[PDB]
Design a protein around this ligand. Structure first.
Ligand SMILES: NS(=O)(=O)c1ccc(N[C@@H]2O[C@H](CO)[C@@H](O)[C@H](O)[C@H]2O)cc1
Ligand SMILES: [Cl-]
Ligand SMILES: [Zn+2]
Length: 257
C-alpha cells in the first residue's frame, strides 16, 4: 500500500506514514495575490542553465523526472530570496486529467493545467540527501502551464514519453536545454515550504513564477498517456498527480515585483 494519488492512498492519507503532512510549512499553497507583499530585500533572481547537462528521463510511478548531472556547478539558481548557490538536479511536472486542474500552487484559487518544478539543492550542503536535513536545503522553481500555443522547447520531452510509459522505465535523455521551458518574465512569488510529495520534507524555498508558459493541448494530452502502473499491469493513467493547497499557517508570501 504505497502512497499515491488514488482514493485510498492519495493526499488525504499521506499524514499516516508522513506526519509532517500536517506540518507548519507544507506545500503547495494558494497564492493570494493581493495579500502577497513586494519585498525590496529580494535580490535579482539568477537562472543560469547555459551549461545544464541532462542525462536521463525516468517514470517513477508518480511523475517523470528529467535528471541532470549535478556533480559540478553547471545549471544553478541564485539570487532572489536565496542565499548561496542552488544546483539543478531534476525537473518534473504535475498535471490533471482535464485542462481545468493540474497545478499544485494556485493563484487566487485559480488552478492551471499543469505545473513544472525545477528542483535545486543548496551546494553548501554537499548533496541532496544532506540538503533535505536543512531548513534552507532546497529551492524549487515552479512554473505554471496553461493550454494554448505549443511550447517548442517542451516537444523533445513529450516525444520521449512513449518510451517510459510505465513505472520504473527510464531512457537516455541527453542535451536537453531547460532554458526552453522558461517564460519571458522572471517575476515571482516566494515563501518557505516543503516537498509536495512524500517525504514532504520542509526544506524548500519556493519560487513560483507569475507568468505561465503555454503548451498545446496535444502536448499535455501525451502527458496523460503515461501510466502510474508498471509494465504488464492493468492501466492506470498518470493524471491528477498533484497535491491540493495546504494551510498557509504562519507564513507570508513575498512578491519580487
Ligand atoms: N514536487 S517537489 O518539487 O516538491 C519534489 C517532491 C519530491 C522530491 N523527491 C526527491 O527528489 C530527489 C531528486 O529526484 C531524490 O533524489 C530524492 O530521493 C527524492 O526524495 C523532489 C521534489
Ligand atoms: Cl484511480
Ligand atoms: Zn513537484
Amino acid at each position: 500500500h504505497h502512497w499515491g494519488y488514488g482514493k485510498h492512498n492519495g493526499p488525504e492519507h499521506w499524514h499516516k506514514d508522513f506526519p509532517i503532512a500536517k506540518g507548519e510549512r507544507q506545500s503547495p499553497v494558494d497564492i493570494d495575490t493581493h495579500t502577497a507583499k513586494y519585498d525590496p530585500s529580494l535580490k535579482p533572481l539568477s537562472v543560469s542553465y547555459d551549461q545544464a547537462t541532462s542525462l536521463r528521463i525516468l517514470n517513477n510511478g508518480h511523475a517523470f523526472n528529467v535528471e541532470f548531472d549535478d556533480s559540478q556547478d553547471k545549471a544553478v539558481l541564485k539570487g532572489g530570496p536565496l542565499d548561496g548557490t542552488y544546483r539543478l538536479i531534476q525537473f518534473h511536472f504535475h498535471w490533471g486529467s482535464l485542462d481545468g486542474q493540474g497545478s499544485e500552487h494556485t493563484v487566487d484559487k485559480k488552478k492551471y493545467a499543469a505545473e513544472l518544478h525545477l528542483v535545486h539543492w543548496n551546494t553548501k550542503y554537499g548533496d541532496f540527501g544532506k540538503a533535505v536535513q536543512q531548513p534552507d536545503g532546497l529551492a524549487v522553481l515552479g512554473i505554471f502551464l496553461k493550454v494554448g500555443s505549443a511550447k517548442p522547447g517542451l516537444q523533445k520531452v513529450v516525444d520521449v514519453l512513449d518510451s517510459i510509459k510505465t513505472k520504473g522505465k527510464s531512457a537516455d535523455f541527453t542535451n536537453f536545454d531547460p532554458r526552453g521551458l522558461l517564460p519571458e518574465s522572471l517575476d515571482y512569488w516566494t515563501y518557505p515550504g516543503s516537498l509536495t510529495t512524500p517525504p514532504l520534507l520542509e526544506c524548500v524555498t519556493w519560487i513560483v513564477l507569475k507568468e505561465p508558459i503555454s503548451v498545446s493541448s496535444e502536448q499535455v494530452l501525451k502527458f496523460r498517456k503515461l501510466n502510474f502502473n508498471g509494465e504488464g499491469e492493468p492501466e492506470e493513467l498518470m493524471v491528477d498527480n498533484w497535491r491540493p493547497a495546504q494551510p498557509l499557517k504562519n507564513r507570508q508570501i513575498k512578491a519580487s515585483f
